[PDB]
């Protein structure tokens with residue numbers, strides 16, 4: 001039983017506004033053109049091994065089911081862009097899902113491993129930072145012990161911290177600058 | 184993931200055959216006219232409190248999903264005939280569900296209480312047979328101690344046993360005549 005009181009009439013608009021200006025109004029507003037044909041669900045490789053149905057995400061969005069933001073289903077999309085490529089209504093499906101995830105993240109629906117990966121780029125400027133074995137491995141091959149990346153360049157590392165703070169990404173992931181850990 | 188190997192192409196025909204000649208070919212074949220509009224599900228009173236969706240039963244039947252016969256969902260239908268009354272495609276929905284249940288029963292998907300009720304009509308000719316308190320109650324009101332029913336008339340009781348045997352209802356419910364009890 002789904003009553004009006006359970007639905008959010010602005011959910012669709014909220015997704016569009018979250019998608020403006022990145023990736024853009026015209027891109028995200030494409031969800032409004034979906035005619036629930038199911039080409040996205042049949043194309044989905046994740047749907048072949050889970051309860052995830054790409055078409056229902058768009059449906060829930062258009063109907064106003066906020067629970068979609070709390071669903072684990074949206075995080076099962078690998079972003080292979082196969083649905084995006086085949087949709088006959090030009091729905092920027094993959095892009096819409098990412099934007100939906102942006103709203104989910106703002107609601108506090110983020111995995112720890114994900115927040116950890118985000119923290120390593122904030123702290124060491126990289127998703128997979130170099131370890132003690134990296135230095136030995138790079139040397140043994142015939143490459144610079146330390147690669148010319150932002151990890152070993154404070155200037156670049158600080159530039160990211162400035163941008164992050166301004167963007168509010170630190171607040172989003174719930175990062176405490178003094179402790180250097182998440183909340 | 185639903186593959187062809189999991190489906191039974193003849194399921195729909197099997198339901199129609201089970202419904203012939205009772206309630207009839209034309210009655211049960213009406214499932215073939217369902218266009219999945221959902222008027223039956225919206226009308227269903229059971230569907231408001233359960234996962235039961237009247238429209239999906241018809242869908243599974245047309246698609247070939249045998250699991251529908253093993254589902255508890257079909258047994259949640261109260262036979263209120265509300266879907267039957269509103270379907271715009273003249274689908275004899277209530278009648279189809281009963282026939283579907285007939286096939287479920289043949290597969291051995293019957294509740295014990297149901298099998299027990301069926302046994303009481305086989306043994307005592309009635310769903311709710313008279314007990315020691317009935318005789319006292321009927322007397323105290325001003326009615327015949329024993330009602331004029333098949334329960335206290337062997338002739339009528341034996342007639343039912345003859346029909347049952349011929350119908351194979353005893354075999355269906357898995358009733359052993361010598362022990363007077365059910366099997367499994």
Ligand code: SF4
Nearest residue numbers: 034036037038040087
């Ligand atoms: S494909 Fe585009 S149109 Fe068909 S459903 Fe998936 S989203 Fe709506």
Ligand code: SF4
Nearest residue numbers: 044077078080081083
């Ligand atoms: S993109 Fe996300 S949704 Fe579209 S197909 Fe690859 S996984 Fe399924």
Ligand code: SF4
Nearest residue numbers: 217219220221223270
């Ligand atoms: S109503 Fe008659 S037609 Fe519409 S769904 Fe239920 S059955 Fe199929």
Ligand code: SF4
Nearest residue numbers: 227260261263264266
């Ligand atoms: S008949 Fe069985 S199904 Fe059709 S409505 Fe009444 S209960 Fe729901």
